[PDB]
Amino acid sequence: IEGRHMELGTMLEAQFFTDTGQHRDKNEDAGGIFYNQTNQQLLVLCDGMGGHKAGEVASKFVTDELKSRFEAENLIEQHQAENWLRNNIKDINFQLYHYAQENAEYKGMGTTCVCALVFEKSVVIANVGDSRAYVINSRQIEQITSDHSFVNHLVLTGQITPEEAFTHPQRNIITKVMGTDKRVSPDLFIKRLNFYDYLLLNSDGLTDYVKDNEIKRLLVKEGTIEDHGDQLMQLALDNHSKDNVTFILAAIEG
Ligand SMILES: [Mn+2]
Ligand SMILES: [Mn+2]
Ligand SMILES: [Mn+2]
Ligand SMILES: [Mn+2]
Structure with a gap:
């Protein structure tokens, strides 16, 4: 294959935030921030299904596997x-x-x-x-991923509006999830970091109770990444979130 040049190793200031919540008992969200041999950065977040057995076992499993495999890696173009x-x-x-x-x-x-x-x-x-990746600057918050959920299947087919999906009675149903089938087709995206201040990864425990407007205005305010994470978790809890709440916040600079 053809001659290609090596890009330098790059990482963002990223922090991992997770909380079980008062309303549930155990945290079935997992995740972390891992680095390979050349110090490339991988952010990982998993939401174990609460409606099924042993969600924490599944999420912990996928997280530990990704951490091991990635930490074993040298370089990925x-x-x-x-x-x-x-x-x-x-x-x-x-x-x-x-x-x-x-x-x-x-x-x-x-x-x-x-x-x-x-x-x-x-x-x-x-x-x-139905875990999400967002990108945020002073003017826009854009969700990069598309929820593999039933209500988003209705949204993408013009059957309900997003506002209807937010209060739809079946908004918890997942249509693509790890461990239920021998095969899986993951969605893949490339996103330019030119003009954004934050990369966000989160489980639905946040965005099922905090809409994108609140996230945007909380993040575009002043404050460090620790302050933004603390205020974002507390905002999820103030909107009466009753799932596990987990998100990685990654600050971007040019
Ligand atoms: Mn879960
Ligand atoms: Mn359980
Ligand atoms: Mn959900
Ligand atoms: Mn959840």
Whole structure:
């Protein structure tokens, strides 16, 4: 294959925030911020399904697998990041499928998974489920991923409006999730970091109770990344969120 130049290793100031919530008992969200041998940065977030058994086992499994595989890696080019994320996500899905099938305590477990590979100017995002990746600056908050949910299937087919989907009685249903099938087709995205201040990854425990406007205005205000994370978690709890709330906040600079 053709001669290509090595981009430098790049990372963003990113922090991981997770909370079980008062209303639930255990945290079935997992995730983390991991680095490979050349110090490339991978952000990982998983939402284990609460309606099924052992959501924390599934999310923890996918997270630990991605951490091990990525930390074992040396270099991933930008034009190969899509293949890397898709392949490893597929294999982890297969392993999680047989993991749930063979263990009777874990029968039917599953988890969402959104993850981002950070490069000098782009971010490569892979998504399976209704966890989200946003990009935010002073003027716009754009959701990069598309929810693999039923209500978003109705939205994308003109059957309901997004505002209707936010209060739809079946807004919890997931249509693509890890561990339920032998195969999975993850959604893959490339996003330019030119004109944005924040990359956000979050489970639905946040955005099921905090709309994009509130996130945008909270983030575009002044304050450090720790202050923004604290205020964002507290805003999720103030809007009476009753799921696990987890998000990675990544500050971007030119
Ligand atoms: Mn969950
Ligand atoms: Mn459970
Ligand atoms: Mn949901
Ligand atoms: Mn959730």
